[PDB]
Amino acid sequence: GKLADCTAQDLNRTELFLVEGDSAGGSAKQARDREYQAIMPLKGKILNTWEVSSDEVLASQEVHDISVAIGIDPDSDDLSQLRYGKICILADADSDGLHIATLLCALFVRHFRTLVKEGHVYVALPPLYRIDLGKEVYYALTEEEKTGVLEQLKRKKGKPNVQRFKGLGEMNPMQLRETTLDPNTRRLVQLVISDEDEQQTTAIMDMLLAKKRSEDRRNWLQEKGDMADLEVMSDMAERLALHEFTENAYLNYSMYVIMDRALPFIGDGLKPVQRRIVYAMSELGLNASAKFKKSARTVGDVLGKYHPHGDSACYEAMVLMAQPFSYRYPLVDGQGNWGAPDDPKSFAAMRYTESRLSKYAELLLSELGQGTVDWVPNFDGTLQEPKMLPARLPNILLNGTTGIAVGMATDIPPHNLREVAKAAITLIEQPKTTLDELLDIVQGPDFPTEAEIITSRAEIRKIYQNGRGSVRMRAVWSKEDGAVVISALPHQVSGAKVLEQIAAQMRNKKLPMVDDLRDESDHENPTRLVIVPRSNRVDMEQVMNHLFATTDLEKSYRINLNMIGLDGRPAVKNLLEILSEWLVFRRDTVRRRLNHRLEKVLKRLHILEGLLVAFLNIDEVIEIIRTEDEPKPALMSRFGISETQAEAILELKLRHLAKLEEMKIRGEQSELEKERDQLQAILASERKMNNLLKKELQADADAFGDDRRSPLHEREEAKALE
Amino acid sequence: GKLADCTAQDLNRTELFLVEGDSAGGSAKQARDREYQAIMPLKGKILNTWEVSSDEVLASQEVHDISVAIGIDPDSDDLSQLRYGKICILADADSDGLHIATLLCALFVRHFRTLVKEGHVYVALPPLYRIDLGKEVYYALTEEEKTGVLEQLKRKKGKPNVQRFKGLGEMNPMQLRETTLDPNTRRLVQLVISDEDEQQTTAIMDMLLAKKRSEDRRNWLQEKGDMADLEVSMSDMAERLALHEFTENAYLNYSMYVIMDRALPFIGDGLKPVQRRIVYAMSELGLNASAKFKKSARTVGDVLGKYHPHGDSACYEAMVLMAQPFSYRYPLVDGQGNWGAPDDPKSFAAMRYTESRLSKYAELLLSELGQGTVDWVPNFDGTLQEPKMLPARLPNILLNGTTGIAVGMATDIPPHNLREVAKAAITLIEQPKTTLDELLDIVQGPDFPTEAEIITSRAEIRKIYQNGRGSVRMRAVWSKEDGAVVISALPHQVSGAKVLEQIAAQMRNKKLPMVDDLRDESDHENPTRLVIVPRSNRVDMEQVMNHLFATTDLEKSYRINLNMIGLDGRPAVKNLLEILSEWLVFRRDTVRRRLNHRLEKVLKRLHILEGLLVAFLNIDEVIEIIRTEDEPKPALMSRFGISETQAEAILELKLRHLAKLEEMKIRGEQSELEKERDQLQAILASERKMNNLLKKELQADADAFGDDRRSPLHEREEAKALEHH
DNA sequence: TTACGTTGTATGATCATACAACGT
DNA sequence: ACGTTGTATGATCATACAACGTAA
Ligand SMILES: Cn1c(=O)ccc2ccc(F)c(CCNC[C@H]3CN(c4cnc5c(n4)NC(=O)CO5)C(=O)O3)c21
């Protein structure tokens, strides 16, 4: 039993539901009104059928099963020949479910135009959130309706307990039946194109799901976001046009992917999943000095506390943060099979691996508790998570992330820590610093390989001025004992792949100067593959140039400095803009940290003053406590003391009545007064704060920095043979 | 995978390593000596190859990959020269790894006996424990001397720790190379079946790896357990070993681990270790019955990273089984999401799309956990503590029951009614010399979580509960409406869809031409409603029902094997009287421990209160001593004849407590604690008082958690109707 | 009369997609 | 044309082990 069939052929009311996965499929099949309804499970996502011919959809198995399970052949039939009466799209209310629904809708448009023109295609409106503040069960579908509860929430008892349905599997079968399956209360919407909106629907769908219209999708997203800035409805409708449903669903999915899935934040240089992973690891006490713990617990904590997504993506992000060959400055230190340079994805499983935070990760979490960043409730509302991290160094450039989203993408390469820190310090010293001065300090990307960067300085200047660009890297080809020994490989290049590519040269004998191909790599020499050419009359250097031109020993890397800025909007920024925005972020975080410490110092100083007042009149204070029935107001009135100070006096212990504790209090008061003076002076003068920032950056660079790994030297274009 | 072949054909020294999986495969491939060694991954276990013919081993991919990767066809001969000289087994030192090694050894002996006689079979001895103090690489596997190289760290920093390395994944590739792959430090052992002991080896292996002789292996296990007051000065280093020793020891270890830690429940809490770890981790997560639901992914991660060193899928399956009402008579887990269906129990969702919490019944296992009721043991990493047992207020081993299969033994404990078992326990406490028949007058028998009917006679049930082993039978519950048979209840673990398919198969084959309409009128209001409409009112529907019972799944049998781990720590088959008596002993022990814990707390607090009152009487002198003496504790002890803990309590008193209201509160606390101490000592001093308290507690638990019997017991005929010319 | 199918903790892996952007 | 980079949507397979009941 792969699908679910009914026990009736009456086309009047027979219904088929296309669900996301068998996790929801089980709930749908157990909650179904069989002989009336049917459920068809799909193995995950489907394929964009807009840019594929109607005769060529015979490769995927989900759509093949749909075609066998549906009367309509994939071509434009228009005949009735229908198995199930009503065809419904049952996709989860999350943005990813909306994307799957949009893909299914595109498939239903390019191949089943009759099923929409006749009016037999329906879309389910499943809820995503349930609010239970009492006997006031409330359901919502989107975050824009999960925030309208802040209106009728005029209660001070019975706190709301929001529950987010992770798709449909989280939903109980009876709840799913009542919301989206039982016709007496289900919110099914008939999707109609009609002659009035046929052209409009075709135009919008072509704009959305086209491989070449991505520019017009960027324009669409920009325009809608801009007019959303101005104005951030559901009228309980039984029918809707495709041009509205598909447009809204793809807008939601694109915005979610752009701002919550694939683009990093300028401050911490992390995508949301990475931030949640690091925060959950910190909350587990998995600091660099702690003992290793199973990655399974970390993944479970991330999924059950902050991230409502899959296991595999979280584990892949963890491995990427832990792999030295993927991250220039890894955030995770691991024990076990954490991948290999030739096969990065050959890592073990969360049951057979141990993980801990790296020392570098301290630069993202040292100031987390000192009111530095804003915090937001999690999906269930039972916890709080940091929206950002107090990055002491600009991790967006030191490590860099590569990601692809809807409309946009990003390919930020890593850079050297010390050089970027020096650039930031120079920018602080001279705010009106040109890009060229910074490029004289950073010189460009610093990949985690000992290979060479061959792109010219002028091209790098163009890339760092316009943002977009491409860099190129080569190999080290130094000769020892008359034999060529390759010691360093380009980034994301497998030695086995290079050997297999060279084997094409060996078999085709385009260059018959070779005499063997062996890999003598060992633990002492990480990569040692020896290629023995002819004698010393052939000038093998040009043959190496040809090999660079043909094989993967010289490769290019895209650069797209696209990120979410402090304004909350994606944008492409140059080196100067990135550094300025990160400096603003660091100044803000340092100000918040200083204010937090100042508040703590002032409160403790007030308490210490009250304690000293109590110590001066200890006998009278004890007499008042032992004689007066309400000693707190009496203490407040007699000594002109505050309620918090009176409570501190009342909470003093007998052991503190000794003179040594009084001396300790006096010393603490003196030190805290000096600290308060220093903090107030720093917060009052801009130059003092700039000096503090420069000192912190220099100290962090000296304590956590390292030398450049990939030297930058200009090289020729190579290329040969024709 | 792609067998990661080497770049050399020298048959003299080429080595192939069989690993347990690509998780360990990556580390092995990174730890390999290039063209000197090779690694072939295996997808878990393969098969017991002892009782399979030499022509039936070659298959699609399991044995075929090994045979191709080695060249030697399993023909007991043909020792050619194709791929690799030496064949090595790289299995983890854990009991499952020993099982894998035993299976591989069976495959290599029953079909490649020449490859062992000539000497080409080696076993790796990888370490399981790691001490990580310094920058001096340490590896060693052992259990008798949990010391050793540790002691050579009396000149560096750091305190002893423990790393269990899981099975192989936790090892770093370089660590794997140093331990079991690089010959300069590798500890490989050549497995040789000497010609002098071959007859003995075949005798042992036939005892071990036989589908039918495995049953009577309990005598081997029983003897080894009995001879526990003996132990091998260790096996030291031999550089070579006989299979008769290696296979016997490995299979003994694996069988003991499966019996006592994987498949048999403990008599006290009635739980297998994985279930206990799940429940404990849920309790430590605050997932009480009154708490909010949390994602099962977090629970599984906690179980795997804190207490259970095994796979996630098995843990999730056990959790789902504990949560399904149609699987557990008294479920321990309450869930939100797709937690399965009675017709498709394994159709549940995933731990990312489901929420879980402990059930109210689970309180009966954890309410007294925080006291001194149970023993605690360090976990695998040594950074936490785990309860060896749970303070079961009721005998969950009989109320819920578990079914499991292990090496040598198995167990099929059926569920029972809570109230009936509680009444039986109360009667046993009242009359210790109560016969089995008297208990059976209260306990009617098993109580499955279905409204179906139990048809086995009372005498047969008595025989089952007297001899332990037996079999029970259940028949569906059906009712006639409008002259048509309506089935309302189905037997346990029976899908309605399966019954409908079976009856439709009979209808299509026209075995029963008296039928006229087989319909499924099941709905949410009525869980099971299967309607059989016969062709008219002259058809003997009773005989057709008897035929269906004899032929379809409407009548099913259930094995009963009351095998469990007793308080002695040894598996045994126990009868109803033995189970009840042993659990009563366990409950008495736990209650005594709880009372002693509360008594100790009460006495310590009374001591502190006495010190506080003494301080209150002489507050001025105490304050003067504190303000004048640098070390006030000995001075207070000398002046007031007071204890060190009392002196510290006086020093930790707050100024707000110096008021008269706090003194009155302390005096009231003292009076209440004196009464509590008197009551606890009276209960602990008299057996009759403790027995009365136990009866009261059992009755209260039965009244708060009990329910009526779900499966009535009514005797029915043998059926066996129709199917004749 | 002899071969298959369960129950349940365990050993373990593999399959099809979206989405932007450039080099081959 | 294809093949990558990486967070995301959802699943699929081969076994051990005891003990009885179909069932062919
Ligand atoms: C994992 N595979 C393979 O290799 C090979 C083939 C294959 C075929 C179909 C499949 F469908 C799967 C996935 C199994 N089904 C996934 C479960 C596991 N899981 C989860 C979550 N969080 C965890 C954890 N497991 N494990 C821990 O230890 C703690 O964290 C879920 O939520 O769905 C497969």
Numbering used by the authors:
A (entry chain C): 400 to 631, 1001 to 1490
B (entry chain A): 400 to 631, 1000 to 1492
Reported in the publication:
DNA gyrase and topoisomerase IV are essential, homologous, highly conserved bacterial type II topoisomerases and are established targets of many successful antibiotics. These enzymes resolve topological challenges during DNA replication and transcription. BWC0977 is a pyrazino-oxazinone based novel bacterial topoisomerase inhibitor (NBTI) currently in Phase 1 clinical trials and demonstrates potent activity against multidrug-resistant Gram-negative and Gram-positive bacteria. It targets both DNA gyrase and topoisomerase IV with balanced low-nanomolar potencies, showing remarkable superiority over ciprofloxacin and gepotidacin.
While structural analyses confirm NBTI interactions with DNA gyrases, the interactions with topoisomerase IV remain speculative. This study reports the first structural analysis of K. pneumoniae topoisomerase IV complexed with BWC0977 at 3.05 Å resolution, alongside biochemical characterization revealing its potent and balanced dual-targeting mechanism. The asymmetric unit contains two copies of the ParEC-core dimer, each bound to double-stranded DNA and BWC0977. The 7-Fluoro-1-methylquinolin-2(1H)-one ring (LHS) of BWC0977 intercalates between DNA bases, engaging in π–electron interactions. The right-hand side (RHS) of BWC0977 consists of pyrazino-oxazinone and oxazolidinone moieties, which interact with key residues D79, M118, and R119 of ParC. The -NH group of the pyrazino-oxazinone moiety forms a hydrogen bond with the ParC D79 from one subunit, while the oxazolidinone nitrogen interacts with the catalytically important R119 and while maintaining a weak interaction with the D79 from the second ParC subunit. These interactions stabilize the closed DNA gate conformation, effectively inhibiting the topoisomerase IV activity. Further stabilization arises from π–sulfur interactions between M118 and the pyrazino-oxazinone moiety. Structural comparisons between BWC0977 and gepotidacin reveal that the oxazolidinone ring of BWC0977 forms two to three additional hydrogen bonds with the R119 side chain guanidino group as well as the main chain NH.
